[PDB]
Symmetry: C2
Subunit: 306 residues, 2 copies
């Protein structure tokens, strides 16, 4: 029993973290096979970041200008190229601890683990979710750029995020492993606005199901509702609209508890209108939306991974 | 910026997890050097657990009755002994991935990372705290016994917890790596009561400091207070009493924010008496007490570890 924000084991990713240095800027890189991936703004100085012309800045850089370091041993750069917002540094030695990996672009509402790194060394692990406004609520300090977000599926590592920048309200933005940003953000030191942050309704319902599995059932009322009626209430509270696909996804949880999805929606409707009156759910006084239905099944069944 | 429940990187511990089988009971073991540690109730059947006589049950077991398995390869048991509530199985092969480790008995209010395992395979990582009633609010299913709690200090792993049992109200109990339980619990399938759970005041203050570092300052009022006056209010709300040692420990955080500890206590006093009125602190509608002052410094300075 119990429920916690659980992260994936970081062992397979710790061996791929290296340190990339260009001039005085030092950040983290992802060493897979004989290629190292890192944010392209490592070639920028403190002044270039205000209005960087990455093409022109790359003209004045050569292979020997990149210092890649894995522990006390450094890698020799024999080729560099820019793919969108990431730099691909070709090194002479292939990573012997390379796991079976993929590159995936993950959708909003999905979750992943973040291995926060500094100077190529893993510092900590935590779980995040891609917000609907294409930002994440992570924990990053200076020098954390190049840290990667990942998922583990059996024995494969699915890389989906690389940290690039911090927004002036404290949230974080980045790219996939192909250099494409999540959202309309650019790697420029300029004022950039993030859109409205809405609540992932399907994730709230999955979390409410986890509470029912773990004892908390005070929020369960008598009423039921319809998709159209619940969604009309959800739009006033900036909640994502529920679809029949979301209902099928919640299938495992509804069958485990014996509570239909529409019945749980009516319970969520009362919580949105009347609040919680001081009662907690799974040790939380707010509605948690950073557990996917898949994460709840994992914690309430016990999938292992190698 | 940002703040999240961050766990330590689990790479060094994943290589020490094995699977221990005795009869039909299968659980996790900690493989360090040529010794495997696991909860002693692996020798119990479903019936023995009601009133186990561990000495008598161990008389009928021999070395070849223990199946230790590390992946697809199994270890041969050449010696077994019982130290308090853990079994020490001596194996023929030493773990080649053995990290530099310690065994520590950790104090209440301190935190650690848990690598939840099933059948010897790491499933997930999360951060816990030793509650003052010597229980933890973890996330464990059947077969999770033998999972270990640990801390990383530079390059050393400090093992401090091994999961043994679940309490009838959903909290979890276990031992240190020397077999001694935390709290007055025994490894018996019988009704066992946990004491009153109080709030770790020094951890709440550290969390309030992290909020001030990250923008949230609405709770900061005009008043100050004294240790005796704050502690009189803390005893009504089941809070741990603050000492001068706690004030010295919060030294780094008070100097970073310019807010004296006694000033922060007066702000916590108003929150205990008047509530939060619907406002959130660091994305939480309750007072968080599972961040030690050391964990906050780590997240707000960026210590790395190898």
């Amino acid at each position: 029993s119990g429920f916690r924000k659980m992260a994936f084991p970081s062992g397979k990713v710790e061996g791929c973290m290296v340190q990339v240095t260009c001039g005085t800027t030092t950040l983290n890189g992802l060493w897979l096979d004989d290629v190292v991936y890192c944010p392209r703004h490592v070639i920028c100085t403190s002044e270039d970041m205000l209005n960087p012309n990455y093409e022109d800045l790359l003209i004045r850089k050569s292979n020997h200008n990149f210092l890649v370091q894995a522990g006390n041993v450094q890698l020799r750069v024999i080729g560099h190229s820019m793919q969108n917002c990431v730099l691909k540094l070709k090194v002479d030695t292939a990573n012997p601890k390379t796991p079976k990996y993929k590159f995936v672009r993950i959708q909003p509402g999905q979750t992943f683990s973040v291995l926060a790194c500094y100077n190529g060394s893993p510092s900590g692990v935590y779980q995040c979710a891609m917000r609907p406004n294409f930002t994440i609520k992570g924990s990053f300090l200076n020098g954390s750029c190049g840290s990667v977000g990942f998922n583990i599926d059996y024995d494969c590592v699915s890389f989906c995020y690389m940290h690039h920048m911090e927004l002036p309200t404290g949230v974080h933005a980045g790219t996939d492993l192909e250099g494409n940003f999540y959202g309309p953000f650019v790697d420029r030191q300029t004022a950039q606005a993030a859109g409205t942050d809405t609540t992932i309704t399907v994730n709230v319902l999955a979390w409410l199901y986890a509470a029912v599995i773990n004892g908390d059932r005070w929020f369960l009322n008598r009423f039921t509702t319809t998709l159209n009626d619940f969604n009309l209430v959800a739009m006033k509270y900036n909640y994502e609209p529920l679809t029949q696909d979301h209902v099928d996804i919640l299938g495992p949880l509804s069958a485990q508890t014996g509570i239909a999805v529409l019945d749980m929606c009516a319970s969520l409707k009362e919580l949105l209108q009347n609040g919680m009156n001081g009662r907690t759910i799974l040790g939380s006084a707010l509605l948690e939306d950073e557990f996917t239905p898949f994460d709840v099944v994992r914690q309430c069944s016990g999938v292992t991974f190698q």
